[PDB]
Structure 1
Amino acid sequence: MNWEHLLSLKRQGDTAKRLRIEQDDTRLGFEVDYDRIIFSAPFRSLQDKTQVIPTDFVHTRLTHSLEVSVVGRSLGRMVGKKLLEKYPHLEQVYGYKFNDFGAIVAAAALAHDIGNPPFGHSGEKAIGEFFKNGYGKRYKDSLTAKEYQDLIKFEGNANGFKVLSQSKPGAQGGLRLSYATLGAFMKYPKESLKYGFFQSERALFEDVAQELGLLKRDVSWSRHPLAYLVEAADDICYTIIDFEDGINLGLIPEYNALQETSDRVSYLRALAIGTLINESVDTFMKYEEEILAGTFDQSLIDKSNYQAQITDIINLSIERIYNSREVIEKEIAGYEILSTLLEARCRALDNNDTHYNQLIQQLLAKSLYENLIQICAEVSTMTDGKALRNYKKIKGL
């Protein structure tokens, strides 16, 4: 791959190339992306969306994404400095700066959880199951193998890609984020037939991939190098910060001057994240060659020298947090809530003339496929409050 192309400032619809050297410092494309996300309706909605984790402080999805983005900016900034020293022409010729790299990773990391449905992975599985063995099965014969697969294996990252680019009468291209940011956002650059985009966004990513110059591999491409840093920010934060929350929560049983547990835990978290950030940067530059070639077959943290302690932390979290009664009860309830909303929307879609279904449309509100993936997208992005409430009214409460 080529860095000059990987750092594209192209926005959907552009008819002409944007040159880094021409950019207005006060309106840097990559930095503008961060600000568009912050003020966006979907990001804002994260304020009212909790993680599956259940007093002390516990992150909602908005604060979790904020902290992940801060870790992301530091990772990008650091790699950026080293990348410009290794490839000095990027700066002296093309005008790129180390903070451009922090901006790209920060923005992509900030929006990473933006399209995930409530209830974490159980939420995704509930949606998938709805179309596999639930009411949604009825559409199987009216869809292609990939359109149907999109539904059966509904993935939050693909929905996030849709949320960030969705076209609307008064807003084509959605947030119209820089292509380098969309590339950094894509962890799995492939179709449903652990994938990064639905059929509804295939045309867009092809344009993004071509523009970035991603190595071609039923389409798929090599991962944009900066996506490795977006992934690391996630790995680091979900590992250490969720551990921090589990402790403050009590689920995980618990410098010498600090008298409060949360302060001791916070200091350890900061030190630990700092160590992993520094190491992740070195690992990236160490395998930068393979990453640019598309042969690197793992994550940055996979190569960590603290893989053992990292593994022990993830297992204890799975043990005390994800296997906790509170989380399991929430996920179970989540299946019923999502399954109910999806069925009510699909039945209204099928029989749109009945008084009841019209009410449902008034309450909760193209080809069959566009209508179905849109239903999945809207149900997935509903705030916790709206979803529970709409569910309760449908069930007669």
Structure 2
Amino acid sequence: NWEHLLSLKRQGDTAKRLRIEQLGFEVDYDRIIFSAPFRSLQDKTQVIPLSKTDFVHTRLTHSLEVSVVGRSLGRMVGKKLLEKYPHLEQVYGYKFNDFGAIVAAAALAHDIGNPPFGASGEKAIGEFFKNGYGKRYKDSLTAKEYQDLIKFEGNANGFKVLSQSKPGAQGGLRLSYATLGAFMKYPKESLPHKPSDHIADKKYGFFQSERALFEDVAQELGLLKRSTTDDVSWSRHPLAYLVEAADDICYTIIDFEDGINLGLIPEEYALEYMVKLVGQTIDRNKYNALQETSDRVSYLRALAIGTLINESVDTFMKYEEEILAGTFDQSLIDKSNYQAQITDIINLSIERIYNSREVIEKEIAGYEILSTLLEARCRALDNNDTHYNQLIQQLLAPEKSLYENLIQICAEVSTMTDGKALRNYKKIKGL
């Protein structure tokens, strides 16, 4: 039921907010814009670590583009939905801008829990507990708590950052429940690991300490259970599909364009792989009148994004009933007519950009930096009577369980930028 999916509740509320008596979905955008976690995204790795103030993307600019594309997708889908179910507007009072606001707010914050150095950073944080110092804690934690530690993802960290309670400020940013539902793409815990081939089962979305919180949200939105066991799991919110589609479109095209502009990909491929996407709307005279690679690739990027957005809207509207029922098992991008072109673009990006020498060098350095910082924090946690551990506490982190302390350490390491992490690493070693 769509009347329960578009909820306006906030954490710690007793009177039900109504749409007629209102806007809630724009304050979420404003609150995310003005927060420190969002501001820390300006110097976090998207693909190339330590961007050197070049023209390449960071996490912040990527999130902004995903937000624009998400607003467009949400507006179109909301128009079609309001056409399909008239009573959503004539009784409850929902307009087609609310869907755009929800998807834009969710897409702006979709990537906020990521640590420095990107995917390699998450792998390093996991390997620290798996085959490093943190291994010593294995006997002192529940299997669900250990699987949280050794398979750390930014998806759970983002939910925690968004919904963190502190003395005097309950609920953290206190976003609406619809935004939280559209933000979550893996509504399950860390065990069991990969129970099936469903798209919503690749990873997990919340930690144990936050688990209870999500239950509340999942009760309010009327999500559909899938547990059939002692481990909880729910079905996806329908707008989470749109969030994922926007994320995928943006990074797939922009990575290719950035690699072309950097000199790692020849310009010819730009027309070898993209023409079928842009052939139906390209103006040949305008394309031929341009005189630099940047203009041509920008033109192609704009046309491709438009085409993919339209196709994604059509695909979503086709399989709406299955998504509402919970039986859909793929993403909207896998039901597309240009899957071969996307696959070729991704494979070329993997061969040329992800495995380039400079990228590998930066990832190797990031492994060492993260391991050193985590080991210092953990050793200061174990013994708190020495002078050195007091100094470490004063520099890095100015009544809890062991699991809560370890989660706090992981969270505090992941709020740093690449530059701050490198500077602290050099300071620890006195260089």
Assess if the C-alpha contact under 8 Å between 2:117 and 2:418 holds in 1.
no
Alignment match, 2:91 = 93
Aligned residues of 1:37 and 1:43 also touching (Cα < 8 A)? yes
Check whether the contact 1:52–1:330 (CA below 8 A) recurs between aligned residues: no
Percent of aligned positions with the same letter in both sequences? Answer: 99
Aligned-CA RMSD value: 1.5
Q: Classify 1:17/1:52 alpha carbon distance in 2 versus 1 (closer, same or farther; 3 Å).
A: same
- Matches of 1:131 and 1:349, distance apart in 2: 15
Deviation at 1:298, TM superposition (A): 0.7
- Deviation at residue 56 of structure 1 after TM alignment: 5.9
How far, CA to CA, are the matches of 2:358 and 2:83 in structure 1?
A: 49
Shift in Å, 1:168: 1.3
Q: Provide the rounded CA distance (Å) in 1 between the counterparts of 2:127 and 2:416.
A: 19
Distance in 2, Cα, partners of 1:107 & 1:243: 26
Moved more, 222-231 or 370-379: 370-379
Structure 1 position 170, deviation (Å) = 3.0
Asked whether the 8 Å contact 1:5–1:211 carries over to 2, the reply is yes
Instruction: Confirm or deny: 8 A CA contact 2:252 2:346 kept in the other structure.
Output: yes
Cα shift at 1:378: 1.3
**In the alignment, is the contact (CA less than 8 A) between 1:56 and 1:248 conserved in 2?**
no
Q: Does the 8 Å CA contact 2:122/2:152 hold for their aligned counterparts?
A: yes
Q: CA deviation at 1:264?
A: 1.1
Residue 276 (structure 1) shift = 0.8
Deviation at 1:51, TM superposition (A): 2.1
SS of the residue aligned with 1:213?
A: coil
2:217 aligned counterpart, secondary structure:
helix
Secondary structure of the residue aligned to 1:302 is: coil
Residue 176 (structure 1) shift: 0.8
Greater CA deviation, 172-181 or 45-54? Answer: 45-54
Displacement of 1:52 after TM fit? 3.1
Instruction: Tell me the alpha carbon deviations over residues 197-222 of structure 1, each in whole angstroms, 9 at most, x when there is no partner.
Output: 11111011111111110000011100
- Cα distance per residue 1:178-198 (max 9 Å; x no partner): 111111110100001110111
SS of match in other structure, 2:209? helix
Which is further off, 246-255 or 168-177? Answer: 246-255
CA contact (8 A) 1:348 1:360 kept: yes
Contact (CA 8 Å) 2:238, 2:323: kept in 1 or not?
yes
How many angstroms apart in 1 are the aligned matches of 2:209 and 2:345? 38
SS in 2 for 1:199: coil
Structure 2 counterpart SS, 1:276: helix
The whole-number CA distance in structure 2 between the counterparts of 1:170 and 1:337 is: 34
Shift, 1:58, TM fit: 0.7
User: What SS does the aligned partner of 1:64 have?
Assistant: helix
Deviations 1:143-177 (A, max 9, x none): 11111111100011110111111111132111111
Structure 1 runs (4+) greater than 6 angstroms displaced: none
Cα separation, 2, equivalents of 1:119 and 1:272: 29
Report the TM-score, using the length of structure 2 for normalisation: 0.89
Query: Does structure 2 retain, via aligned residues, the 8 Å contact 1:52–1:331?
Result: no
The one of 36, 42, 45 aligned to 2:37 = 42
Q: Could you say which residue in structure 2 is the equivalent of 1:258?
A: 290
TM-score (norm 1): 0.96
Residue by residue over 1:353-383, the C-alpha shift from the partner in whole angstroms, topping out at 9 and shown as x without a partner, is 2111111111111111111111111111211
Give the whole-Å Cα distance in 2 for the aligned partners of 1:312 and 1:190.
32
Q: Please give the alpha-carbon distance, in whole angstroms, between the structure 2 residues aligned to 1:386 and 1:10.
A: 37
- 1:16 Cα offset (Å): 2.0
Paired residue for 2:255, among 242, 245, 253? 242
Deviations 1:94-119 (A, max 9, x none): 11111111111111111111111122
Structure 2 SS opposite 1:191 = coil
Equivalent position of 2:277 in the other structure: none
The gaps in structure 1 that reach 5 residues or longer are none
Q: How many residues align?
A: 392
Given that 2:157 and 2:206 are in contact with CA atoms closer than 8 Å, whether structure 1 keeps it comes out as yes
8 Å CA contact 2:67–2:103 kept in 1: the answer is: yes
Name the SS of the counterpart of 1:256 in structure 2.
helix
Q: Aligned equivalents of 2:386 and 2:175: distance in 1?
A: 40
Residues 11 and 179, structure 1, Cα contact 8 Å, conserved in 2: yes
Contact 1:51 1:118 (8 Å CA) reproduced: no
State the Cα deviation string for residues 55-90 of structure 1 (Å, max 9, x = none): 962111111111111111111111111111111111
Gaps of 5+ in 2: 192-202, 267-285
- The corresponding residue for 2:244 is 231
1:208 to 217, 230, 255: 217
Q: Is the 8 A contact 1:128 1:152 kept in 2?
A: yes
Structure 1: how far apart are the matches of 2:242 and 2:302?
18
C-alpha contact (below 8 Å) 1:7/1:180 kept by paired residues: yes
With 14-23 and 103-112 compared, the bigger mean Cα shift is at 14-23
Kept in 2: contact 1:20–1:94 (CA 8 A): yes
Larger radius of gyration: 2
Q: State the alpha-carbon separation in 2 of the partners of residues 297 and 95 from structure 1.
A: 32
Q: Which moved more, 1:260-269 or 1:154-163?
A: 260-269
- 1:354-393 pair list within 5 angstroms: 354-365=386-397, 366-393=400-427
Q: Structure 2: how far apart are the matches of 1:44 and 1:263? A: 30
1:122 CA displacement: 1.3
Does the CA-based 8 Å contact 1:69-1:106 persist in structure 2?
A: yes
Answer whether contact 1:56 1:249 (CA < 8 A) is retained.
no
Which one is further off, 377-386 or 147-156? 377-386
Aligned partners of 2:155 and 2:206 also within 8 Å: yes
